[PDB]
A paper describes a structure:
PIKKs are protein kinases that have diverse regulatory functions in transcriptional regulation, DNA repair, cell growth, metabolic control and mRNA surveillance but [name] is the only member that is catalytically inactive, due to loss of the DFG motif within the kinase active site. Although lacking catalytic activity, [name] is critical for coactivator function as it is a direct target for multiple activators and enables the activities of [name] and [name] to be directed at specific genes in order to stimulate their expression. [name] has the domain structure characteristic of PIKK family proteins, consisting of HEAT, FAT, FRB, Kinase and FATC domains arranged sequentially from N- to C- terminus.
We over-expressed and purified [name] [name] from its native host and determined its structure by single-particle cryo-EM to a resolution of 3.7 Å. Sidechains were visible throughout the reconstruction and an atomic model was built entirely de novo with 3474 residues (93%) assigned with excellent stereochemistry, representing the first atomic structure for this member of the PIKK family. Using that analogy, [name] can be broadly separated into four topological regions which we have termed Finger, Ring, Clasp and Head. The Finger, Ring and Clasp regions lie within the HEAT domain, whereas the Head region contains the FAT, FRB, Kinase and FATC domains. However, although the relative positions of the catalytic, activation and phosphate-binding loops of mTOR/DNA-PKcs are preserved in [name], the critical residues required for ATP/Mg binding and catalysis are not conserved, and the [name] activation loop contains an 18-residue insertion compared to its counterparts in the catalytic PIKKs. The relative juxtaposition of FRB and kinase domains also differ as the DNA-PKcs and mTOR FRB domains are positioned away from the active site cleft, whereas the [name] FRB domain occludes it, contacting the LBE (mLST8-Binding-Element) on the opposite site of the cleft. The FATC domain is integral to the kinase domain and is sandwiched between the LBE and the Kinase C-terminal lobe, forming a plug over a large hydrophobic cavity within the kinase domain. The interface is localized to one side of of [name], primarily around the FAT domain at TPR repeats T1-T7 (residues 2572–2830) but also at the C-terminal half of the Ring at repeats H41-H44 (residues 2150–2350), which clearly represent sites of intermolecular contact between [name] and the remaining [name] subunits.
Numbering used by the authors:
A (entry chain T): 1 to 159, 214 to 258, 287 to 522, 558 to 648, 676 to 815
B (entry chain T): 1653 to 2016, 2022 to 2043, 2089 to 2107, 2115 to 2130, 2138 to 2146, 2154
């Protein structure tokens, strides 16, 4: 059934086709029954040249266009399916030399199911030409230019199906200059109809048919598809300024019925924006304000092209980073922060947005440093983004209770998929040891239960996504609020005679900035419950994060939220590594020592009566306070000469009225 | 009185006002407007005044203190809304309020509320009139289609939370006495949103259609047995969206009619080409819709075929289109469409050898899973019952796959069953 046993059986088409109205079930057994699946023992050479006569005699039946489906015109696409699956190393000329006089009939006309045979067969003739180098690509490039000059007639009657892809990706390169590139450019300035510019007045259908508008934006689109491949190794000249307004003019009116062309329309934009001299003038000719979600008004189709629509623009703003004045970059933070906080996009798009937000910041201190009359607006500029970081991992603290639901589902799914490894064949011990022992409530999960869920339910580690987000965003937040220190006032207003003790230590903030510091600390110290060296990295990042924080403006966060940290410590014990990192090594352990002892002196009045847990926590917390007076002690030991005698005597009287009176004397020996 | 005399302190004039009133919520724990609400709608009007005058003028936009005090006013106003017994009229003036800006549902100062009237506690008899005034509000044409997307959130969230935290619509329909939202679903179907299925005028969004796709979809899940002529109106409403031009509305309504016809009201003029153009090649945006639609569809098209279904011509569609695909991602789409159903194809031996050739063309990554899973399919088929060279292609492919290279261990088990149902020298060939 791969030898001449076939040839003894498909004799029903030893003619071309008898009863030509019923060829589709009589002689269409070629690629649909026999050829598609057999073998390849070099047999195709023996009979494909013998069915080229059946090919051309079947090609006798394309006389007439205009809706003649059953004898002719779906048999046309059947012949498309005849051609489209052949490749060999012989006899290219008995196809190519006779195909085009059989394809000449269909190309200028477009109405009532034609305009496809020369093009879509020319995909197959094109790729069959790509395998070889017979040098007649310029010999039959002529009819393509004849199409591209037959276009204004066809848009004069019909107020296309060019499909410019598989003509000029030949890439042979002794090619011509002005006929090919003019065949590109002379479709640009063509109005789609004249009506749509009259539509264009109040965006910042009235044509009689709308299907032809689709057919012409598809051709002008495929124009914008091709000439990047005429650009990506290819330097261009004599015109560079016609492209930007053509790009946004092409994006602005594309129908919401389909955005599958918008995909690599947008790839065809990022190839332009990637290259060097086609970056700078697009601010000079579009000014970036036409790059909002006007490019996406088909939203049920433009909900799966939302990452690619913003990655090119964010990578473009990061790609220029030059001559960006302050108003457009504050525009970029006030849209990209919203793209961060918007939950529906992704995870990696959000981290890409945050990375974009940090990678601008050197132009914020450079730009605010060049003309310092508008310097504090660069500071508040620099803090809107940290507010957006705080809200971003403020949402995770709320999503906590169902994050552990899907994580418990994750290890109960992991332990039923990684348990199959344990019964492997490579074991080589058991038959030897046994030889020896022979010889001897759904809060948030609404979205995942809807009848149109549109994609599979997520099954990764939510914890590792959270830790990726914390290490990433905190890791940016260090050098952000570190680099806040270059915007400070001079000390002469502040009236301090310790000048070089500034410029790393003190800043000054308004109320609605230290609130966002406070809720940064609060909605980060809540965040540790997901997590333990991965926790310790965030302990170190928050600790190191608040060294640069103006300690008289640091003390007010920790006086008011140290009791919250305390009531968090009573459940998880690791957060002492927070407080340890605040007073075993700082500038300002002469502050956190005194604040910690003010808290513990207040909670020594009864607090040996209580259970083992908070007695263990407090008796560690004292010892971490007094281990900050033997490490440093050329520091304020005077932080401790008040309230240490009252600690002794009051630790005696509270021991005579306690319920477990030994913990006070153990506190005396650890003093 | 000092907003329109300067025009730039309006951020520092709204934030001070929600400062003062937010202070006076704290020192009067009951309420300091008798829990009646006259002091605070001046604040909502005030929010529209300062928000309008920042959208008008130039300099300061998206300050920190407006980003805070919107989320503060939101908290005290929305805190008032639960502190009254006319609980349904002030809920929606806020939805009229955020028409300009203010976050698409800045949550937990506005959405933590909206969860509290979702069906817990399980038989509270007040969310009925919430769904009633909600259904009158979504049909109000003269307000904010994006806030009708907000209305998807409230209405369809509380309905599918009812479906989730019950069997299927057990706690409603007290002998069908005053639902007063199913007859506004008769405003929905008996308007049809004619002519084009949403509003020829410039809408800027395509969401409301997908709302009625979901809200139409849930009742075929919920109550496919109670009032089935109403679900026939659900058919003739939902069958119309199939004639659209995108994909993931066409395959979404096509999904929900593919979900319907397993229940009742079976035609044959439609269903055949419904799953034929499910097994017709769609492109990669909503392949999972084709997965759940066809793989939940296909069992009832095996049982509602027979007693009139002696041919497997409906499976010959799968054979012929699997020939037509010009083997690519398109056939790979159909391989799990003969794998997610397994137990009832069992027709002929045409599926085997050509897909063994495909499955040889996989390994010339992320596609090996289908290749070994096909061997689990044939290993199911000779275990469902319990001409030689194709077995040499399968087994010899498995020898070449193990010798070539979690899933390979499963290939060892598949080989470990298949053989007791190449030999010597090929092992000589094997940083």
């Amino acid at each position: 059934m791969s030898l001449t046993e076939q040839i003894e059986q498909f004799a029903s088409r030893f003619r071309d086709d008898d009863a030509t109205l019923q060829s589709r079930y009589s002689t269409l057994s070629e690629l649909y029954d026999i050829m598609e699946l057999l073998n390849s023992p070099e047999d195709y050479h023996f009979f494909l040249q013998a069915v080229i006569p059946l090919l051309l005699n079947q090609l006798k039946e394309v006389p007439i266009s205009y809706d003649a489906h059953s004898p002719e015109q779906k048999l046309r696409n059947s012949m498309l399916d005849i051609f489209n699956r052949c490749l060999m190393n012989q006899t290219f000329q008995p196809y190519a030399m006779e195909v085009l006089e059989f394809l000449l009939s269909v190309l200028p006309k477009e109405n009532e199911e034609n305009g496809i045979l020369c093009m879509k067969v020319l995909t197959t003739l094109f790729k069959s030409f790509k395998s070889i180098l017979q040098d007649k690509l310029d010999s039959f490039i002529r009819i393509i230019i004849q199409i591209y000059k037959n276009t204004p007639n066809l848009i004069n009657q019909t107020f296309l199906r060019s499909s410019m892809f598989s003509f000029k990706i030949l890439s042979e390169c002794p090619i011509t200059m002005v006929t090919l590139y003019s065949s590109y450019k002379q479709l640009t300035s063509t109005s789609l109809p004249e009506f749509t510019p009259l539509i264009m007045n109040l965006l910042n259908n009235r044509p009689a048919y709308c299907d032809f508008i689709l057919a012409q934006i598809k051709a002008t689109s495929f124009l914008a598809y091709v000439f990047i491949r005429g650009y990506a190794p290819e330097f261009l000249q004599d015109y560079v300024n016609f492209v930007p307004d053509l790009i946004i003019r092409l994006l602005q009116d594309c129908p919401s019925e389909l955005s599958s062309a918008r995909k690599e329309l947008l790839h065809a934009t990022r190839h332009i924006l990637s290259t060097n001299y086609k970056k700078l003038f697009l601010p000079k000719l579009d000014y970036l304000f036409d790059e909002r979600i006007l490019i996406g008004n088909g939203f049920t189709m433009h909900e799966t092209l939302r990452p690619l629509a913003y990655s090119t623009v964010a990578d473009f703003i990061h790609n220029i980073r030059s001559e960006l004045q302050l108003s457009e970059i504050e525009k970029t933070i006030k849209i990209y922060t919203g793209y961060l906080l918007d939950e529906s996009l992704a995870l990696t798009v959000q981290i890409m947005s945050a990375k974009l937000l940090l990678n601008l910041v050197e132009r914020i201190l450079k730009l605010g440093k060049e003309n310092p009359q508008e310097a504090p607006r660069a500071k508040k500029l620099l803090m809107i983004i940290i507010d957006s970081y705080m809200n971003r991992f403020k949402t995770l603290n709320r999503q906590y209770d169902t994050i552990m639901k899907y994580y418990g589902r994750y290890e109960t799914h992991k332990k039923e998929k990684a348990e199959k490894l344990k019964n492997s064949i490579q074991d080589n011990d058991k038959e030897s040891e046994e030889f020896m022992r022979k010889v001897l409530v759904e809060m948030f999960d609404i979205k995942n239960y809807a009848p149109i869920l549109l994609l599979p339910t997520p099954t990764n580690d939510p914890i590792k996504d959270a830790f990726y987000l914390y290490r990433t965003l905190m890791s940016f937040l260090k050098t952000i609020i570190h680099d806040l220190k270059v915007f400070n006032p001079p000390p002469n207003e502040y009236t301090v005679a310790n000048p070089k003790l500034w410029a790393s230590v003190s800043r000054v903030f308004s109320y609605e900035e230290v609130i966002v510091f406070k809720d940064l600390f609060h909605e980060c110290i809540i965040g540790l419950k997901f997590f333990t060296k991965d926790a310790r990295e965030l302990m170190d990042y928050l600790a190191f994060m608040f060294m640069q924080m103006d300690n008289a403006t640091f003390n007010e966060i920790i006086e008011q939220e140290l009791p919250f940290v305390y009531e968090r410590m009573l459940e998880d014990s690791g957060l002492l590594h927070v407080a340890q990192s605040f007073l075993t090594s700082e500038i300002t352990s002469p502050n956190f020592a005194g604040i910690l002892l003010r808290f513990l002196k207040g909670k020594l009045k009864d607090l040996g009566n209580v259970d083992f847990n908070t007695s263990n926590v407090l008796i560690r917390l004292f010892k971490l306070s007094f281990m900050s007076v033997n490490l440093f002690p050329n520091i304020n030991e005077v932080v401790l000469l008040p309230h240490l005698n009252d600690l002794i005597l009051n630790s005696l009287k509270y021991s005579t009225t306690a319920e477990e009176p030994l913990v006070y004397f153990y506190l005396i020996r650890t003093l | 009185s000092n907003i329109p005399k300067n025009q730039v302190r309006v951020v520092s004039f709204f934030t001070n006002m929600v400062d003062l009133f937010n202070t006076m919520v704290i020192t009067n724990g009951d309420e300091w407007l008798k829990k009646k609400g006259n002091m605070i709608l001046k604040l909502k009007d005030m929010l529209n005044l300062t928000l309008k005058t920042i959208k008008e003028n130039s300099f300061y936009i998206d300050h920190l203190q407006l980003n805070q005090s919107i989320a503060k006013f939101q908290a005290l106003y929305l805190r008032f809304t639960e502190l009254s017994e006319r609980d349904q009229n002030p809920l929606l003036l806020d939805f009229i309020d955020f028409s300009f800006s203010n976050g698409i549902k800045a949550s937990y100062s506005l959405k933590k509320f909206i969860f509290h009237n979702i069906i817990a506690s399980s038989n509270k008899e007040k969310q009925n009139n919430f769904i009633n005034d909600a259904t009158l509000f979504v049909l109000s044409d003269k307000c904010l289609d994006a806030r009708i997307f907000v209305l998807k959130n409230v209405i369809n969230s509380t309905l599918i939370y009812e479906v989730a935290t019950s069997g299927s619509l057990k706690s409603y329909l007290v002998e069908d006495k005053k639902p007063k939202w199913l007859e506004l679903l008769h405003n929905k179907i008996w308007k049809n949103s004619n002519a084009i299925l949403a509003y020829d005028v410039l809408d800027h969004h395509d969401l409301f259609r997908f709302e009625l796709l979901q809200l139409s979809a849930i009742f075929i899940k919920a109550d496919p047995e109670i009032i089935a002529e109403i679900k026939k109106d659900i058919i003739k409403f939902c069958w119309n969206f199939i004639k659209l031009e995108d994909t993931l509305i066409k395959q979404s309504a096509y999904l929900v009619t593919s979900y319907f016809i397993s229940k009742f009201d079976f035609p044959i003029k439609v269903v055949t080409q419904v799953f034929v153009a499910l097994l017709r090649s769609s492109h990669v945006e909503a392949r999972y819709l084709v997965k759940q639609s066809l793989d939940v569809l296909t069992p009832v098209l095996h049982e509602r075929m027979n007693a009139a279904g002696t041919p497997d011509t409906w499976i010959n569609w799968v054979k012929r289109v699997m020939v037509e695909n010009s083997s690519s991602q398109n056939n790979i789409l159909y391989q799990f469409l003969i794998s997610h159903p397994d137990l009832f194809f069992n027709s002929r031996d045409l599926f085997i050898s050509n897909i063994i050739h495909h499955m040889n063309k996989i390994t010339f990554s992320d596609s090996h899973t289908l290749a070994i899973d096909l061997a689990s399919l044939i290993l199911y088929w000779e275990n469902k019952t319990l001409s030689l060279h194709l077995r040499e292609a399968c087994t010899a492919f498995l020898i070449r796959y193990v010798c070539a290279s979690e899933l390979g261990l499963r290939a060892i088990n598949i080989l470990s069953e298949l053989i007791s149902d190449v030999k010597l020298v090929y092992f000589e060939k094997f940083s």
